[PDB]
Design an enzyme around this catalytic site. Structure first.
Site, PDB file in Angstrom:
ATOM      1  N   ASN C  75      -8.625 -25.399  30.870  1.00 14.91           N
ATOM      2  CA  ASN C  75      -8.109 -26.336  29.598  1.00 14.91           C
ATOM      3  C   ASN C  75      -8.443 -27.668  30.386  1.00 14.91           C
ATOM      4  OD1 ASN C  75      -6.451 -26.543  27.033  1.00 14.91           O
ATOM      5  ND2 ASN C  75      -5.615 -27.989  28.700  1.00 14.91           N
ATOM      6  N   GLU C  76      -9.396 -28.615  29.883  1.00 15.18           N
ATOM      7  CA  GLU C  76      -9.687 -29.896  29.774  1.00 15.18           C
ATOM      8  C   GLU C  76      -9.718 -30.404  31.387  1.00 15.18           C
ATOM      9  OE1 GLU C  76      -6.014 -32.017  28.382  1.00 15.18           O
ATOM     10  OE2 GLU C  76      -6.758 -31.312  26.074  1.00 15.18           O
ATOM     11  N   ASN C 126     -10.767 -29.351  22.332  1.00 20.22           N
ATOM     12  CA  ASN C 126      -9.403 -30.198  21.755  1.00 20.22           C
ATOM     13  C   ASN C 126      -9.790 -31.300  21.162  1.00 20.22           C
ATOM     14  OD1 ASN C 126      -8.052 -27.997  23.017  1.00 20.22           O
ATOM     15  ND2 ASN C 126      -7.569 -28.997  24.994  1.00 20.22           N
ATOM     16  N   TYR C 132      -5.097 -39.140  17.843  1.00 25.60           N
ATOM     17  CA  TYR C 132      -5.203 -39.899  18.815  1.00 25.60           C
ATOM     18  C   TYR C 132      -6.804 -40.539  18.321  1.00 25.60           C
ATOM     19  CZ  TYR C 132      -1.787 -37.811  22.264  1.00 25.60           C
ATOM     20  OH  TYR C 132      -0.834 -37.228  22.978  1.00 25.60           O
ATOM     21  N   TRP C 211      -2.250 -27.174  17.523  1.00 25.72           N
ATOM     22  CA  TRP C 211      -1.692 -27.741  18.480  1.00 25.72           C
ATOM     23  C   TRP C 211      -0.324 -28.303  17.649  1.00 25.72           C
ATOM     24  CZ3 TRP C 211      -1.473 -25.878  23.231  1.00 25.72           C
ATOM     25  CH2 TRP C 211      -0.502 -26.155  24.142  1.00 25.72           C
ATOM     26  N   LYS C 232       4.354 -31.790  18.468  1.00 30.25           N
ATOM     27  CA  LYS C 232       3.392 -31.407  17.482  1.00 30.25           C
ATOM     28  C   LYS C 232       3.534 -30.182  16.775  1.00 30.25           C
ATOM     29  CE  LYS C 232       0.099 -34.604  19.663  1.00 30.25           C
ATOM     30  NZ  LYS C 232       0.588 -34.997  20.810  1.00 30.25           N
TER      31      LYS C 232
HETATM   32 CL   LIG Z   1      -9.669 -31.503  36.724  1.00 30.25          CL
END
Ligand SMILES: [Cl-]
Ligand SMILES: [Cl-]
Ligand SMILES: [Cl-]
Lengths: 660, 657, 341
Positions: C75-76, C126, C132, C211, C232
């Site tokens: 994730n990310e 995402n 954002y 999310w 959220k």
């Molecule tokens: Cl990372």
């Protein structure tokens, strides 16, 4: 005859927030409960109620005497209980206060002293804001007084009961008026003898006694008068001479009660163009400021700590002190008496400076309490020769609730209590604001070269103000600069005041130039360095650790004199030989060529760098020795400065290393 | 038409311990700053000063009117500033207070309100101690009141300006003395018509008007006497009837100011031997206590929270509620008015109980302020028909500073303010103590079978006291036991109250036995359960988590009714069908043999265990169905209960020997 | 469908998904910094050997659950600093040794060019366009752009959401500041209606993941109505209160439990007299009553949205009720409401 018993040992304490039983812990007075949380840099340290309990056996033989509990300091608000019945409340963290417990105890038995202290925030007890710590607790001594049922009363504002007022002071004559509180606690009218004996050691200098009648359960005031021809004057540090004045109550011969106090005779005036004239002769007030705390213990100070702070100022050549920002301890005023140091002491009417909120809130309770605090200050300490001005505020604003009216009221309260000493104040207002024109003297806090600008801004500002209001008596209440003894660098460059880097060399530079600015201006009746010592301010986030105002000339633990201290010692202390290299703590340098600087009160010194001479030189007007373009060598160096003056040969040296 | 503008939205906040500039953050009223630290179990949560600022635009069309800032609740000491100039301080965290700003603003431009709020400790503002949290902040609403220059005054102890005193009530006739405060903010004399209209829906029930002249810059108090023949009496939950009383100011034929207030007419008395008699008929007062907080938000409550509390109480059959330990929200009084629940509300004169320190400190600023809170409470909430008693203290002690004279002084203050309702108190002293005999009614907090002892000890102590003091009008101010929904065990055993284990089955056993003791004793005019709801007490270290008093019948988030809730519901609510197995949360059992308990207000139910019938059973006098020697299978088990009249209730569990 | 973030969860919850029929994306805790500081990958030997163990633990422990349908690998993460892209390839190979029956996937926030987006069989991103930065319509353009650039990728939306306090209300629809103390509810509602429209027009998306279903703990956060909360969720952190947007989905997604729900019931103090009144339903029609007066019947749009424009409220109290009749079933919803100015 009369008894004074220290009650500091073995109290029990708990926070009211510890609501369960058996949570009490032993403490030993003096005591604050913020010596750990506040000193660690926590801005929201513990402000609220703490509970001290003492068990005190009341002797049978004490029945028929009078018993008082005197507290020399309790921050901020105190409620006192005897066997858990309320006997009194005192609001104010810095005056002494007292309560009679003659009618409140069980003779021949243990009794319970309970002191519920609050240092939580209020809007009605000064100080409301301030750049320091409001340490909560019984942080000064606590005493049981036992006197005769007829006594010289300790009850009037917790004063000594003897107040010594000076007029007509000259080198030839002085008049002293003696105000005595006398209290008859017996149910019978009494014929007593009241006497005053002023002494030089054990030699009586003057003496008057008086017989009078006083009814039962009554008190009255008596004002005796005496004179001294060719009095030995208290003359600052040149000769801090001190009479002791003893006032006695007598009954059928034999003394029944006695109180002794200092008497220092002096005359002085503050001149708008000549500065401070002490006993007919001009006297620069070479001043520092002093807070009443210390590393690791906060404001729970012991006698030896006061003595040490006094010795360090005496060493540096200080002859004036501003005791910021509150009434301080009797034994510090004592030391200033005995050293000859002139004292500026003030009530805690402290404004916000560059921070938030206000030092004045227009509440009846606040205004009223303030007048009682100023009355405590003068009645408790007026006998000290060293006190020479009464200060009424530090750094109020006229914006929002305007305190100018109230200040004028306080000024009048001061004059009711003491005509013999000027009032002053420490302002940060533009000169046009009315509050600068109330007190007999006035002064400004100025940080030209720290909080912006350059030091030259100061002399211009002072010159201009002195010109536009030629009748003001102007002084510098505060001037100073931050410095960590572990922040070093080769070059002078102005640090950011609010940051984590206060290099020591800039504090040195700042005081050099600023003392030059002050020393060229005789119209200033004094200057006061902020500060003599680093001091606790839990909300600071700057220098080498949070929670510290680091503008002291000496470190918070009183261990390390910064360079600037020795600059002032070179200039102000012409008695002890001084020869001191600056920058000894800059031990890893990046340049090969440096400017070397020392401070001395010797006529001549010669610099040596790896044994290689760089010439003799004489200090400038302000004790500064300077050699530009001194070539060091890569790696290790030794730097030594030497001075010979007949038999007196002095030396100072340090080592350092150059990398690149 | 009088304007009422909510001022809760977008304020600037910072602690005073945040000395630096640019440290303000946005808050939205209602607001406390102790919703995170106190409810996390921090005993020294932040008790200090917080600064609220709002910019508010003063319209030019308001020049010539009057302008009022009214605060429904700010804990505990507030000082209010208009454009940074002080206009007053209020000491006390639970009464409403008001300040006029008419002369304090610049019309047509922006202005700023600064409210400096201090919840720091004080020895002169009750409560000084208490088993709860002193959440600081402006935690109730904040309004701007715009009125005519001549108005029904809102200034007297922040009261509505209208007092509806029921001087004589009977099933045939009620006489109501109406007190209206009128303020002339004009510089000239004014002749105005005062009128009151008592309305039933839209029908004018009675009506009285009068004309007078009020000189400029003068205040006056009028008293009109209304009468209602054959009145519709407010009679509790059976029939909570409310008239509306609309007082209006007229001028040259036009209405210029209006105030409406409830009117619920009733008479009652508290009999030493028979209990509480409402409108001539006996009422058992089946009561719970309630605090004004909730999980995650502290006391920064909204309307829906008040309403959900009330509904949960009505669901359980509550018909009396004791509002501990302080004046609460007008909005919650309205609810009890509308449901028909009798209210006990008290000043925060709270003593230490099991804890340290004192509820009383003998100093005159404390005494003074206390009388002001008592006057605040009665003058602000006296128009609610639900409020039937005024309470003076909770758990004061005679040791140390004896508050007994001061409680006598406080009793006389309430009688001065309100002769129509009796005074009460919540004691924990031995019956010998003089402070028990000052108030009209008296009651005790007792925890027989939780803090020591067994439930049978309550009846004996109560019985002994009624016999010793037959003139006392006695009630149980508090009784209760702690429970966590996550502490479960097989058998009933008494926990250590100060420990980290508070099994639910003990709370259920405790309440079923204590109600039996109370139900037998009609000379009790009431009983109040501690507590309807789990509540915040930062110093607590017990139950399943610190900072919680867990003697509630419903959890701190109002999500889960404990078993005891359903016991009371089956006993007190005979309108809603109830059939509810105890102990569904004890899902892992160690014994095969079990006692299976259920609660119901049906006349019988039949238990099934893995489909096998254990028998049709009838509840006992207290709504309890119990089957002994129930034999469970190892492993999974389904326990079901059924009734017909057709209800069902069931849960699953597993057995591990 | 559920994406269990960001770590193996409880067997009994996997069981629950099996029994409801909800498809499950579950993953190892190979979590990147996102918008914060530091790294999810540090190129230590122990870190890498541990990560493999945690993935073998994941598969060997829960492979029996039929609901699990993709295996998540990270994730990310970011390629800056210690590049994890090789180590991602190892894990994907470990997944393939461990289990051949399920595709591997991941939740990325890298530009589409980065290699670490092509390792796993499927990939998701995402996106928070409209919360954002940006507008909700930026999300559509990016996906299509990405789908067009790499027509082989199996693209899903692993995250999309928007903060909301049920105590932050207001009259008009203004983009709030995410890191501030003000998350009005009407915006989260607007966000999800627009983002779901973007998702539902794009059949090449193999899934989308809100999310989050619930507000969850995150001590560092200082936004919304209290510190320490990622707000959220569609439901509050205590599972007690369903925010507006929950009911937008239930109307859209649950065609078996009848729904008729007015939006903005918690905004009980308005400052304007004209309102747009929105409700969500899966009924065919509803009629709006404002103070007992009909504003007409209306039909839901394609996404279950009833809207009555130009609603006039009186000053002071108001009652807003909406009512539905479908053969046997009659539904009503109402809430009280106050206008000041
Ligand atoms: Cl990372
Ligand atoms: Cl100020
Ligand atoms: Cl008490």
């Amino acid at each position: 005859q009369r008894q004074d018993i220290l009650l500091n040992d073995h109290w029990n304490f708990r926070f009211s927030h510890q609501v369960q039983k058996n949570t009490e812990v032993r403490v030993d007075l003096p005591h604050t409960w913020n010596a750990q949380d506040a000193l660690s840099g926590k801005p929201d340290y513990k402000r609220g109620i703490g509970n001290y309990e003492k068990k005190l056996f009341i002797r049978s033989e004490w029945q028929g005497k009078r018993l008082f509990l005197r507290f020399e300091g309790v921050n901020s608000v105190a409620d006192v209980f005897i066997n858990n019945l309320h006997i009194g409340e005192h609001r104010g963290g810095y005056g002494a206060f007292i309560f009679e417990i003659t009618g409140k105890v069980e003779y021949g038995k243990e009794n319970s002293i309970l002191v519920r202290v609050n240092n939580g925030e209020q809007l009605d007890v000064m100080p409301l804001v301030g750049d320091f710590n409001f340490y909560g607790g019984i942080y000064r001594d606590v005493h049981l007084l036992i006197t005769d049922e007829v006594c010289i009363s300790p009850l009037d504002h917790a004063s000594p009961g003897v107040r010594l007022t000076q007029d007509s002071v000259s080198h030839k004559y002085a008049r002293i008026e003696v105000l005595v509180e006398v209290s008859n606690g017996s149910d019978k009218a009494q014929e007593i003898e009241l006497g005053i004996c002023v002494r030089d050691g054990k030699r009586t200098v003057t003496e008057r006694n008086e017989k009078f009648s006083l009814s039962g359960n009554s008190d009255m005031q008596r004002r005796l008068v005496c004179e001294i021809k060719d009095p030995h004057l208290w003359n600052g540090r040149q000769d801090p001479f001190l009479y002791r004045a003893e006032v006695t109550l007598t009954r059928d011969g034999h003394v029944i009660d006695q109180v002794t106090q200092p008497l220092g005779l002096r005359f002085y005036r503050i001149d708008p163009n000549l500065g401070f004239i002490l006993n007919g002769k001009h006297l620069p007030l070479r001043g520092v400021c002093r807070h009443q705390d210390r590393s690791e213990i906060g404001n729970a100070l012991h006698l030896q700590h006061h003595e040490e702070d006094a010795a360090l100022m005496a060493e540096m050549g200080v002859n004036a002190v501003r005791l910021a920002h509150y009434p301080q301890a009797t034994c510090f005023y004592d030391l200033m008496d005995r050293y000859g140091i002139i004292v500026w002491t003030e009530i805690p009417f402290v404004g916000p400076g560059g921070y938030m909120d206000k030092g004045f809130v227009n509440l009846p309770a606040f205004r009223s309490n303030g007048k009682e605090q100023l009355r405590e200050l003068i009645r408790q300490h007026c006998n000290h020769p060293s006190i020479c001005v009464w200060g009424l505020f530090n750094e109020l604003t006229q914006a929002g609730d305007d305190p100018t009216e109230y200040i004028e009221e306080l000024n009048r309260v001061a004059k009711q209590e003491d005509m013999t000493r000027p009032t002053t104040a420490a302002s940060n207002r533009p000169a046009t604001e009315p509050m600068n024109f109330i007190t007999d003297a006035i002064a400004w806090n100025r940080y030209d070269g720290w909080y912006g600008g350059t030091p030259s801004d100061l002399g211009k500002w002072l010159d201009d103000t002195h010109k536009k209001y030629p009748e003001l008596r102007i002084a510098v209440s505060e001037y100073g600069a931050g410095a960590s003894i572990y922040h070093q660098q080769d070059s002078l460059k102005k640090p950011e005041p609010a940051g984590w880097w206060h290099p020591e060399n800039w504090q040195t530079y700042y005081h050099a130039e600023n003392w030059k600015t002050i020393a060229s201006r005789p119209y200033l009746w004094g200057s006061f360095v902020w500060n003599m010592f680093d001091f606790g301010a839990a909300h600071r986030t700057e220098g080498d650790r949070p929670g510290i105002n680091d503008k002291g000339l000496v470190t918070f633990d009183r261990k390390v004199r910064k360079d600037a201290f020795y600059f002032y010692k070179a200039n102000w202390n012409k008695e002890e030989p001084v020869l001191y290299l600056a920058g000894r703590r800059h031990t890893v340098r990046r340049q090969r060529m440096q400017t070397i600087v020392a401070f001395t009160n010797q006529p001549e010194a010669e610099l040596f760098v790896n044994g290689r001479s760089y010439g003799k030189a004489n200090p400038d007007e302000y004790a500064v020795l300077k050699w530009q373009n001194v070539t060091l060598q890569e790696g290790e160096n030794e730097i030594q400065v030497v001075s010979k003056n007949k038999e007196l040969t002095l030396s100072d040296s340090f080592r350092c290393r150059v990398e690149s």
